[PDB]
Design a binder for these strands. Structure first.
Ligand SMILES: [K+]
Ligand SMILES: [K+]
Ligand SMILES: [Mg+2]
Ligand SMILES: [Mg+2]
Ligand SMILES: [Mg+2]
Ligand SMILES: [Mg+2]
Ligand SMILES: [Mg+2]
Ligand SMILES: [Mg+2]
Ligand SMILES: [Mg+2]
Ligand SMILES: [Mg+2]
Ligand SMILES: [Mg+2]
Ligand SMILES: [Mg+2]
Ligand SMILES: [Mg+2]
Ligand SMILES: [Mg+2]
Ligand SMILES: [Mg+2]
Ligand SMILES: [Mg+2]
Ligand SMILES: [Mg+2]
Ligand SMILES: [Mg+2]
Length: 150
RNA sequence: UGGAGAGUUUGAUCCUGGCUCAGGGUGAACGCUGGCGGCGUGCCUAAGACAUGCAAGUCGUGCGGGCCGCGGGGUU
């Protein structure tokens, strides 16, 4: 019902008297490839617990993507922190052209052909959040005319 | 009908930031190796110095001859 794929897994460390103590953080995307995505970042003392927790958080934070023939309706440009994401629709037969993080996010959303570009900071966390906010800032012609009814 | 990023400053993080790599290209060279064909291509340096051969001539339907040779005439 729901497909799940992790973006990256890292091991952070705090300092305590006697040595460093580790804590694992993991990004997880979940999607049905129908137009719904979810992104979660889980932290746990061990890796599998962190992956499961990131999956829970990703299912809790969902985004409805307005797909139009497997591509995006209009080009977007999002600044999350110092990271920038540039999304642009593409004609079918092109394929998802993106870095690992946006490729995974958009593929789990049900996108087949799109042109992206990461700018500024390449940080996978900020890039993931920028792509999520980009998909959250998408509008359709129906929504546009819905706003301009008056 | 058109756009992918990654490694690296820290105990860990975010940012700035340089360096490096994956791509394509070449009148290329070098190493190891090396079977055939087609089409291209081949002094990027000393515009340094050059043996040798060839590479710019042709018209007797513009003109008079030289040399060598043959034939026929004016003459016993
Ligand atoms: K902003
Ligand atoms: K690191
Ligand atoms: Mg929507
Ligand atoms: Mg900025
Ligand atoms: Mg930068
Ligand atoms: Mg860098
Ligand atoms: Mg320092
Ligand atoms: Mg270190
Ligand atoms: Mg410190
Ligand atoms: Mg190269
Ligand atoms: Mg190369
Ligand atoms: Mg040989
Ligand atoms: Mg040949
Ligand atoms: Mg030749
Ligand atoms: Mg040259
Ligand atoms: Mg020369
Ligand atoms: Mg005679
Ligand atoms: Mg007589």
């Amino acid at each position: 019902d729901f497909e799940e794929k992790m973006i990256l897994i890292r091991r952070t460390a705090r300092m305590q008297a006697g040595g460093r103590r580790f804590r694992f953080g993991a990004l997880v995307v979940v999607g049905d490839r129908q137009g719904r995505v979810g992104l979660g970042f889980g932290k746990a003392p061990e890796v599998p617990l962190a992956v499961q927790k990131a999956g829970y958080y990703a299912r809790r934070n969902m985004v409805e993507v307005p797909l139009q023939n497997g591509t995006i309706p209009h080009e977007i440009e999002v600044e999350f922190g110092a990271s920038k994401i540039v999304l642009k629709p593409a004609a079918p037969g092109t394929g998802v052209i993106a870095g690992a993080v946006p490729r995974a996010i958009l593929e789990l959303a049900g996108v087949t052909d799109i042109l992206t570009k990461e700018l500024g900071s390449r940080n996978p966390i900020n890039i993931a959040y920028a792509t999520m906010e980009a998909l959250r800032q998408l509008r359709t012609k129906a929504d546009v005319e819905r706003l301009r009814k008056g």
